[PDB]
Amino acid sequence: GSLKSACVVCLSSFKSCVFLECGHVCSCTECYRALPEPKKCPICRQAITRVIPLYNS
Ligand SMILES: [Zn+2]
Ligand SMILES: [Zn+2]
Numbered sequence: 001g002s003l004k005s006a007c008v009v010c011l012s013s014f015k016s017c018v019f020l021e022c023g024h025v026c027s028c029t030e031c032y033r034a035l036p037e038p039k040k041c042p043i044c045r046q047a048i049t050r051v052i053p054l055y056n057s
Contacts, residue, residue, distance in 0.1 A: 008042050020050040
């Protein structure tokens with residue numbers, strides 16, 4: 001289910017982040033950090049104001 005579960009940026013780590021405010025779950029944590037500034041969601045291209053773990057903190 002890699003379309004559903006693999007990070008859409010590297011395709012090498014599982015998705016692990018929720019992007020706010022757009023709400024999309026598309027990226028692992030390393031790819032988020034690596035995103036060029038200003039950081040935008042790979043899915044919808046909205047600015048990412050905050051990252052929270054998909055695994056509930
Ligand atoms: Zn990744
Ligand atoms: Zn988005």
